[PDB]
């Protein structure tokens, strides 16, 4: 077999170039102001006195925080990033084919794996030994050929993250599921509805009547002393979030550790 050294085509196939991780952007995953606005078709958000529409800056801000919330809501790494870990030796798992669980998952690829002492490599494992399970976040060695623990013996460098899916409706284990995109959308949408729900009427108005010279107008509104103007949509979005998180917490597993 011949390959770019670390990327042995069975155990550690290359999925991204370490230059592309700088080139990828939120819009490449479909997280864009236009995508949010699409879910608010027929609505426009604008300053009631000034008339100017809300700018895309706030949309992108909200989207970046929605991605952060999604990355803590599921114990995952979404946008590609280079991770450098110093990991403890434990005898049970070191005996178990040098088992290590990465802090961040999925693994896009492993970049380096060494056993070291004060930064000196004691051994560098051949890349043909590296066994990677991308969605699990597991790395192992299968060698071709006085204490139960010690700190920071293992040095592991890898890329965590997901790539945008290459086919409609489908994703590989290292590609983003189609509806995690929609989950991040829904999180953005829930904040934008909170903004819009202030502006449908003047501040604090929950009923109005005006009568002048035999003309009468009277409006009841979705605002009230209990419920804000976008309560309903937020409730629905919360339902959708609940279903989405149920499904995605079935796709990613339960966390476990042996003590």
């Amino acid at each position: 077999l011949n390959y770019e050294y670390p990327y042995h085509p069975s155990g550690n196939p290359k999925h991204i170039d370490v230059s592309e991780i700088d080139n990828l952007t939120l819009a490449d995953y479909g997280w864009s102001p236009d995508a949010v606005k699409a879910y608010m078709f027929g609505i426009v958000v604008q300053n009631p006195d000034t008339g100017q529409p809300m700018g895309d800056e706030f949309y992108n801000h909200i989207l970046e925080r929605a991605v952060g919330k999604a990355e803590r809501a599921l114990d995952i790494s979404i946008l590609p990033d280079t991770q450098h870990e110093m990991r403890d030796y434990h005898e049970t798992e070191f005996n178990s084919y040098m088992f290590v669980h990465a802090y961040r998952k999925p693994i896009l690829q492993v970049e380096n794996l060494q056993l070291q002492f004060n930064g000196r490599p004691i051994y560098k494992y051949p890349a043909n030994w590296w066994k990677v399970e991308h969605l699990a976040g597991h790395v192992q060695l299968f060698p071709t050929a006085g204490a139960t623990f010690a700190p920071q013996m293992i040095r592991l460098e890898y890329v965590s993250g997901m790539l945008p899916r290459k086919k409609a409706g489908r994703n590989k284990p290292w590609e983003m599921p189609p509806e995690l995109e929609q989950l991040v959308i829904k999180y953005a949408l829930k904040e934008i509805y909170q903004v819009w729900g202030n502006l449908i009427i003047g501040a604090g108005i929950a009923n109005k009547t005006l009568e002048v010279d035999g003309i009468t107008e009277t409006i009841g509104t979705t605002q009230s002393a209990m419920y804000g103007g976008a309560s309903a949509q937020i409730l629905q979005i919360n339902e959708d979030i609940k279903e989405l998180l149920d499904g995605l917490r079935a796709y990613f597993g339960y966390n476990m550790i042996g003590l």
Partner: protein, 56 residues
């Protein structure tokens, strides 16, 4: 030769599961305080919402 000798499962439960990083440094807090002869008579204090041990 082949069995599971595992005594049981320590169920800790809260509003959401710990991240893997949190759980691995909790494993370090555990082993540095409680393992072997060196830890043998210490008792951990834990303030989780509920703690259960299932005998298998």
């Amino acid at each position: 030769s082949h069995g599971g000798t595992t005594r049981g499962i320590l169920q800790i439960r809260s509003d959401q599961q710990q991240s893997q990083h949190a759980l691995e440094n909790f494993k370090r807090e555990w082993k540095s305080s409680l393992s072997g002869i060196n830890g043998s008579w210490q008792i951990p204090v834990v303030m989780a919402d509920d703690i259960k041990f299932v005998n298998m």
